[PDB]
């Protein structure tokens, strides 16, 4: 590995970072109530092209749409809102000096508590956006147009009976798996015997049904990620908690007697890693889902891969030196 570095000039704690689909742009958000966009030149540099206030609370994520929907960003907040932003050519008005060409097209206000996470859907579901919040609900919004991004229809609520900290869409472009969403929980109660829940779109009811709940995840969860699918007959799911975990979720083939209800999974833990000696605060996958990254209170981002026997191990440690 080799590193380049950038002074980020956020005026309080940064909470998140996210790439565009091409890795040519990146977004970052802060407790100073700002979002920033930074763009990668045809010289290998990176420059801050927009730096504006997004919300009234601390901003807890930032995320991009797929570029067949153009140049669209979403951000979630401690003020209980989420907001949708579009980059516009030629609108930038000197009549209102120091506003952005990233314009807010809408604000979502439906959450009764801090909005803890926000994720755009896989593009073959259309222009869909999911959020979750500490009222113990996941909300999913559905745009009827790709240009009039002021209008977003709320078309799915999902009550978890527990608080929500993070969410992950299943990246299956294959029509042989239903649309699915996994949900993590910050709940510190000893009464809730499981902190991860998984929901499935059942077209026969048009509901997001529950399929599963991970009864081995007794401990609070901070982040969650499905692995990009190299044709696999089974899903892979990373979780950030007191340790790192990697689960397999293999669909049980229904017999021709099992009408109405959702699918069910043959589920394993393939790996569980304490090695952070501390809590885990993000989990994100490489583009092919073969390498996991995770961070913790040890000041290390740690890299994890399968060997040729699917025995997952730590492969690298990216850590600060403090010089």
């Amino acid at each position: 590995f080799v590193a380049r570095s950038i002074a980020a000039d956020h005026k309080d704690l940064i909470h998140d970072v996210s790439f565009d689909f091409h890795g040519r742009r990146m977004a970052t958000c802060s407790s100073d109530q700002s979002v920033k966009v930074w763009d990668k030149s045809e010289s290998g540099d990176w420059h801050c092209t927009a730096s504006w206030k997004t919300h009234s609370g601390s901003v807890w994520r930032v995320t991009w749409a797929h570029p067949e929907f153009g140049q669209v960003l979403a951000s979630c907040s401690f003020d209980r809102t989420a907001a949708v932003w579009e980059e516009i050519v030629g609108e930038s008005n000197d009549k209102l000096r120091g506003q952005s060409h990233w314009v807010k097209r809408t604000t979502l206000v439906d959450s009764r508590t801090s909005v803890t996470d926000v994720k755009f859907a896989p593009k073959h579901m259309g222009l869909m956006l999911a959020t979750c919040s500490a009222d113990g609900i996941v909300r999913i919004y559905e745009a009827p147009d790709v240009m009039n991004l002021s209008q977003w229809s709320l078309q799915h609520e999902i009550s978890c009976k527990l608080s929500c900290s993070c969410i992950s869409w299943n990246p299956s472009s294959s029509r042989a798996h239903s649309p699915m969403i996994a949900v993590g929980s910050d709940d510190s109660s000893p009464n809730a015997m499981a902190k991860v829940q998984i929901f499935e779109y059942n077209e026969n009811t048009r509901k997001y049904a529950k399929a599963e709940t991970l009864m081995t995840v007794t401990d609070p969860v901070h982040d969650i990620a499905f692995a990009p699918n190299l044709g696999r007959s089974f899903h892979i799911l990373a979780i950030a908690t007191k340790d790192v975990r990697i689960f397999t979720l293999k669909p049980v083939r229904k017999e021709l007697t099992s009408s109405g209800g959702p699918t069910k999974f043959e589920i394993h833990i393939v790996a569980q890693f304490d090695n952070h000696n501390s809590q885990v605060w993000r989990v994100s996958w490489n583009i092919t889902g073969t390498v996991l990254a995770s961070s913790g209170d040890d000041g290390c981002v740690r890299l994890w891969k399968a060997n040729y026997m699917d025995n997952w191990k730590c492969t690298g440690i990216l850590k600060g030196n403090g010089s």
Binding site: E42, S43, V89, E91
Partner: protein, 345 residues
């Protein structure tokens, strides 16, 4: 004879010969290239290595020696010489840059630059968006360029501003451009048309249009016969080669298959123009001999065009060629250049 390939560890989008002194008896000694798809793109000047010699200690000095470079901004979309020391280049940034060689130093420099020659617009503020400048043609002291913005510009090597601009000469991309006569140009587009423009006319609309019949073959390249200002050759998105007489209706006179892909350049030989050359996204490079000018026969099963693949294999894409006297050069996505000193042996 055999062809001297060289890896240069950058993809080459464009190659051009240095223009020879009028009334000299030299071969083409020097060429220029431009690169694309790197973390850093460049424009470079090269000499052809001398395969005629060995000295006592046995070293192979026959390499295509690098004379000097300069770093570019964006991808080098198109490239042309302007005189015997100056060069012009286009860019993915919509910039157009004039450069100068320094023979007493072996360096390149900028000479002049139009950093906003091509750009896309938007509703009511000058926050313009980058539009790739796609092609450049010179008529010293004058210069013309095209782009994704559908803009035509006329620039000058003594002037800093545009001498004329024509925004939205198409609603699609314009790919390439050539001079029919000094105020009179021809452009090609995403639709499968040749549009002709006269800078004497006080409207912005085209003086004439030509096309294929109905179905859209985008036309990526164009050239115009050295001693026939009415004969034009174009290359398609399919790998077809179309010869036109711009005086005789709306269609090509002659239609030939040249490749299994997108044809990226077409050139008539600068002294021998009953000879033609073409390159493509099918990984091949061809010579064509036809010695009415034979290119305008409506039956190529009576009158001849005899046709040779110059490369002994198919590579990654051949983006470009240039040919001067007996010398020919081409440039590729295989991070490589190919050169011969002799095409007639």
């Amino acid at each position: 004879e055999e062809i001297y390939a060289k890896f240069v560890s950058q993809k080459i989008s464009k190659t051009r010969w240095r223009p020879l002194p009028p009334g000299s008896l030299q071969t083409a000694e020097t060429f220029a290239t431009g690169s694309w798809d790197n973390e850093e793109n460049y424009i470079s000047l090269w000499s052809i290595g001398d395969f005629g010699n060995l000295d006592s200690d046995g070293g192979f000095e026959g390499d295509h020696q690098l004379l000097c470079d300069i770093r570019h901004h964006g991808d080098v979309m198109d490239l042309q010489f302007f005189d015997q020391e100056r060069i012009v280049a286009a860019s993915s940034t919509g910039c157009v840059t004039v450069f100068l060689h320094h023979p007493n130093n072996q360096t390149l420099s900028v000479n002049q630059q139009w950093t906003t020659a091509h750009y896309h617009t938007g509703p009511g503020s000058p926050s313009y968006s980058s539009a790739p400048c796609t092609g450049v043609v010179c008529n010293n002291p004058e210069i013309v360029t095209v782009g994704e913005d559908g803009r035509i510009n006329l620039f000058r090597a003594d002037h800093k501003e545009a001498v004329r601009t024509i925004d939205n000469a198409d609603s699609s991309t314009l790919h390439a451009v050539t001079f029919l006569r000094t105020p009179e140009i021809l452009t090609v587009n995403s639709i499968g048309q040749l549009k002709i423009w006269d800078f004497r006319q006080q409207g912005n609309e085209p003086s004439q249009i030509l096309s294929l019949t109905g179905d859209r073959v985008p036309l990526h390249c164009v050239d115009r016969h050295p001693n026939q200002q009415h004969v034009v050759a174009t290359g398609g998105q399919d790998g077809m080669l179309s010869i036109w007489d711009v005086r005789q209706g709306t269609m090509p006179v002659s239609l030939l298959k040249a490749h299994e892909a997108e044809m990226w350049e077409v050139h008539f030989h600068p002294s021998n123009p009953e000879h033609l050359f073409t390159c493509s996204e099918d990984g091949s490079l061809w010579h064509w001999d036809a010695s009415i000018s034979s290119w305008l026969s409506t039956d190529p099963a009576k009158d001849r065009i005899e046709i040779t693949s110059l490369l002994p294999s198919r590579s990654l894409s051949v983006n470009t060629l240039d040919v001067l006297g007996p010398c020919l050069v081409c440039g590729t996505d295989a991070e490589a250049i190919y050169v011969t000193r002799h095409l007639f042996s």
